Amino acid sequence: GIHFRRHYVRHLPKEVSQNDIIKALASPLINDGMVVSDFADHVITREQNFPTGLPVEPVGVAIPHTDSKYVRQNAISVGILAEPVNFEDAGGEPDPVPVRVVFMLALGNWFDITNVLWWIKAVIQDEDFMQQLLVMNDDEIYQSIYTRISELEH
């Protein structure tokens, strides 16, 4: 299944770069041995080459990830950004994407990858739930996301 724990959610401040977000969101996954040590660096490498900016409304979303061979156990870490930060567009668009919600994926199983992308697609199209992600605290977000993830593994 997919490991999603309380310190896999965190709010991030106003002055963080794309690389800071990656490293922060990956820190607890490394610490828990969910991923290899240089996992953040491969996510940055993969992002520089295959961007994951989703310009959905009302809140921009990003799905940074790397290769499944760098994963030891399935996990997801979630980031809420104080200010919007720009990601390059996933559909090859030249315009950057403002993003306030980040789903870092550390999935080694193809069936989880597709189940999780499908779920994220339904989630960012829920205008209500997106607006909650911008006001809930970490314990609320962790409680809400956790029960939803559990609905995928079954």
Epitope: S68, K69, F111, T114, L117, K121
Partner: antibody, heavy 131, light 108 residues
Amino acid sequence: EVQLVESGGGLVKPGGSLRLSCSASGFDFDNAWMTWVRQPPGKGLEWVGRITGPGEGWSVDYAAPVEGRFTISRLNSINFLYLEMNNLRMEDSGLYFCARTGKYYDFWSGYPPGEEYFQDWGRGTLVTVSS
Amino acid sequence: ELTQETGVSVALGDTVTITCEGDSLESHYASWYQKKPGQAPILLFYGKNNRPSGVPDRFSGSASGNEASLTISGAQAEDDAEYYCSSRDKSGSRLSVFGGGTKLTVLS
């Protein structure tokens, strides 16, 4: 260069058994999904089954007419893929291909579990089932 | 589960479309293979718009409803061959399946 080399094909009587081998080189075999495909005489390509990778625990899916009689497995330390075939029937005769299998999923329009495609193929080994 | 036309003919230099039909194509993309007798299949196209590099640009794939298509723009004599589609046998399935194959005759 990618190379896939099948072996083990031959003549076998109805009801007997045969083990096909596929030697792989030139790519990350340990992490590759691998598929067996067969072509009956004068007929089309038929998907036989597919073994997944480490993240999936090397699980296998099989075509219905072959389920329970065929086993696919791998030995990653020597870069070999195997197909074991029991209670063979005349309609199992044909040319059996080894194929390195990619995975595809389009975020906005895809549906789980996406799609598998066959990006490198061997030349085949011939299986003749005949009394 | 995937149906193709048995055979099509094209004149040298023309454009031809080969199609593949099945319920699962409403949810999944098709991949496309060329095969000639005594030779390994070759992947021509997969997904929404993926042509593996090394495949000539005159090959292109598309999708609409329960059908997938391979288009060859400017058929060459090399293109005389059998063409196979492949996808999920059913929506959401872990299995795969091929169509029966279309024999393309290029009158050269």
